[PDB]
Amino acid sequence: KPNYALKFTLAGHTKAVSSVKFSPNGEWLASSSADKLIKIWGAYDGKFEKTISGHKLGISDVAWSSDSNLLVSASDDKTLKIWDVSSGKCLKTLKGHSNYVFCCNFNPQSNLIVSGSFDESVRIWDVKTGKCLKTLPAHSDPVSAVHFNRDGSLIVSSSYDGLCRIWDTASGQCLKTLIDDDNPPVSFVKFSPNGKYILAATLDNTLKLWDYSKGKCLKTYTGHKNEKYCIFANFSVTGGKWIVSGSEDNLVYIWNLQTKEIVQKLQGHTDVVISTACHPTENIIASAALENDKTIKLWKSDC
Amino acid sequence: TEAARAQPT
């Protein structure tokens, strides 16, 4: 079992925090918020570094480029923005969605961005020009998450329509739809580090690990509360192999990936833990909470 | 203002 202990509390957003992400090089944490701002913090000391501004409405997601130099953000103002982190300047505004942009990610190559929106579509964008390269009629409800696999050759998308779908990045063709009985709303999805599985959250207090090519569900993680919000989950791989998720009972849950036992609950936030992130090289977790809290917390463990 | 992820279904 891990022994995550609270190390820092990062105050400063003036509304709910929506997403936190460590930079691929481990140096930084980026956070997004309903207060329309992105903030950058030191990953190891929690020190505030800068505020990044320009979205016209609140922001639901942020993600880093592979060289840790760019951010992309997804906003209720129906745009994404690409930012130079060092200068804080907006480099490109990606327009084309017709409703809130909810989720975003770069591919490992970081020449593409993928976005999902309340307009039920997934768009794929050229990082260098800002042009929209593909528009996918991906779902019949808001797209809650989009993620590239480890070589950028596939995209997974999830939606309130209850589906996860696997897309061929090059062709835009849908290669697999994952269904599960009554198909409750899928509120999060991401590929596993080895690209063979997907971890999907549904709004019935459940996380599932799927082999998407075999269509088999391999593990189920529960005990937390998730019926209303699109809460990020993670694979933690720097020490022991854990699953990490926020929860609507205001805790961070940590499960053993193989046994599905809850191995730790992290207490400190005073509102829904909407987002967690795992540091790329150290056993460090960042967690972020909604309106009655507005803070980010950094936790550190020996395994 | 507000962000869609910070609002409940």
Residue numbers in the entry:
A (entry chain A): 32 to 334
B (entry chain B): 10 to 18
The authors write:
It is an essential subunit of the SET1/MLL methyltransferase complexes, which regulate gene expression by catalyzing methylation at histone H3K4 sites.
In this apo WDR5 structure, the N-terminal residues (11EAARAQPT18) of WDR5 occupy the WIN site, with WDR5-R14 inserting into the negatively charged channel of the WIN site, as previous studies have shown.
